[PDB]
Amino acid sequence: FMSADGIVPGRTPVRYQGVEVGTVQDISLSDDLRKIEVKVSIKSDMKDALREETQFWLVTPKASLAGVSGLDALVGGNYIGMMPGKGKEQDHFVALDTQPKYRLDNGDLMIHLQAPDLGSLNSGSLVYFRKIPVGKVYDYAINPNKQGVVIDVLIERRFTDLVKKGSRFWNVSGVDANVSISGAKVKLESLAALVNGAIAFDSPEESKPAEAEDTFGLYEDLAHSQRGVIIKLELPSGAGLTADSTPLMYQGLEVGQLTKLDLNPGGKVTGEMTVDPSVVTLLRENTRIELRNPKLSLSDANLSALLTGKTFELVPGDGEPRKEFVVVPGEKALLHEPDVLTLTLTAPESYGIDAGQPLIL
Amino acid sequence: FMSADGIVPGRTPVRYQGVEVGTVQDISLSDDLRKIEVKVSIKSDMKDALREETQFWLVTPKASLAGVSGLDALVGGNYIGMMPGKGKEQDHFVALDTQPKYRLDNGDLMIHLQAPDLGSLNSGSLVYFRKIPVGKVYDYAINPNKQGVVIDVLIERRFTDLVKKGSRFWNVSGVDANVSISGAKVKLESLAALVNGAIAFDSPEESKPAEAEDTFGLYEDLAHSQRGVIIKLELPSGAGLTADSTPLMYQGLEVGQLTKLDLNPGGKVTGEMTVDPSVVTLLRENTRIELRNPKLSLSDANLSALLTGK
């Protein structure tokens, strides 16, 4: 032992699963080499499992955060816990530090999630389906690649059929912090989510069940877990475009959201947008996506339209479906219509004619 | 037992409803197969009910959240609780984990509610009438269809006549703070609702009493539980229309609220609006519903009308 804080040589039981098995006999020091040698007698019933892969630890109460451990050890004195294994033979053991998880093998389902960072999740945080606890987080570890973090979670046996291949997992925080334009709307749903942390998951309708350490991806939010279709956009510039803030308006209703915005070399601004499955059939050839500036109308004032800014507008077409588009400015919107009569006319003088003047018949 | 944490073979009583009945005699291990065999002696008075459908559990204190359980077990040592049933005969039992609810059958009324999700509600959250507690949530479960969640609640005997066929239920949990342009509304209930949650309900005037596990729908808010009449609208576009924010103004007073807004295929924008029962008789043939844009008047400036929109 590194430090035998409260081990009495006379009476200090060795408990396996709370059942007393042995008793501490003697305590000595290995000539002050920061090691405490404890000689403990073990009854003959347990000597069959007294093998090489056996773990020992010292259960001692402490004032931990978000709950106190070792209440039984506080009431009845700190003791020694043991866990047998499948070794060959051993008579000299090294005590552990924090009593590693041993599991129970009750038929539960063990699955893995991959996240860029652990987040607020700790050991013991809950897993929710329909806001009903159906499991808990078992362990966490770092991938051999330093980029990834693997969270190993366990779902109870009664809900093993709930997990499917298409099931999606996200992190839940019981805080809504909407701002909008009227004022700050703050709603507190679940306090346990703030205190502890929670992973919620959703089960699809028709999918095969998942089993045997199937891996999944942990989305950072419920909104990020929403299913959608990726569309690549070749934007002219990103002057008034904001990621996760610029919508795609069709018939006055928002159906898309600009998600990614990048600057490829050569000064090429490109974007990536998620569209909901309702308007996928409207994305075909000769289907145009354009940008509209917020115009100010004195007759019909729209403060919300002024506050939103640039808006993506969708003009459906017909043909083979496509997943990539080229965005043209609003000045050139008339030029890219399927039928349009383009004319070039010469004059010795400009006569004060700009590039936005109309033609009148 | 899966783990006998503090069972002393000498003195460890078996208590039914707090009454000592038996005493733990012996503890042994089933050749290290993660099972603890506990031999307990039971007095001859209880052997009549010692049958197959008998439940046993280990009452042990723990530092639970929003309250600590097993205070008596903490004071007087952890013990074993039992619950008899109506089995045939049994001499080998399997201990349970969390002492499932046994109920009391005092004449209380048991009813069911259906919700898309449990929400903030947990076991023990309170049920309110006129902000007076008249019951509590008993249990929750998942429907065989994965879409629905069934919450089983229990109303006390004294208020069994309060529940009617037309009674409406809604969920009040947490705290919602909404700041307006010139106002601030902090909607919250008692501290137990903030910590755990609550279900409040309203009884109509003339309705038959409800009984025998009658089902109900759990609305998400008091506003959503308000009675109204559904009107379908064939809108031209949804350019400046927001769900649950666009009113229906008659004589300058708000009488309706645009609730649902959808895009049917073919580019057809449709809507669904709730109207209060006062103006139902005004909804007849050749009755027109139109949309007005917020116009700016220099002589009579109306900032609120400008901020409302369509």
Curated annotation (Swiss-Prot), chain A:
Induction summary: Induced by a defect in lipopolysaccharide molecules.
Region (MCE/MlaD 2): 108-220
Complex and partners: Homohexamer. May interact with LetA in the inner membrane. May also interact with partners in the outer membrane.
Gene: letB
Family listed: Belongs to the PqiB family.
Consequence recorded when altering L194N: Well folded and assembled into a hexameric structure, but loses its function
Function statement: Forms a tunnel that spans the entire periplasmic space. Is probably involved in the transport of lipids between the inner membrane and the outer membrane through the tunnel. Forms a dynamic tunnel sufficiently long to mediate lipid transport directly between the two membranes without the need for a shuttle protein. Binds phospholipids. Lipids bind inside the tunnel. Required for outer membrane homeostasis. Contributes to membrane integrity.
Protein name according to UniProt: Lipophilic envelope-spanning tunnel protein B
Domain comment as written in the entry: The seven MCE (Mammalian Cell Entry) domains of a single protomer of LetB resemble seven beads on a string. Six copies of this linearly configured protomer associate laterally to form a homohexameric assembly. The LetB hexamers form an elongated tube consisting of seven stacked MCE rings, each formed from the association of six identical MCE domains, with a central tunnel. Rings 1, 5, 6 and 7 are dynamic and adopt open and closed states.
Consequence of changing V195N: Well folded and assembled into a hexameric structure, but loses its function
Species per Swiss-Prot/TrEMBL record: Escherichia coli (strain K12)
Disruption phenotype: The letAB mutant is not sensitive to lauryl sulfobetaine (LSB), but the pqiAB-letAB double mutant is more sensitive to LSB than the pqiAB mutant. Double mutation also increases sensitivity of the pqiAB mutant to caprylyl sulfobetaine.
Effect listed in the UniProt record for changing L74N: Loss of activity
Stretch list, region MCE/MlaD 1: 1-97
A GO MF term: identical protein binding
Keyword terms: Cell inner membrane, Cell membrane, Lipid transport, Membrane, Repeat, Transmembrane, Transmembrane helix, Transport
Impact when changing L306N: Well folded and assembled into a hexameric structure, but loses its function
GO biological process: intermembrane lipid transfer; membrane organization
Span within the parent record: 53 to 413 of 877
Region (MCE/MlaD 3): 227-330
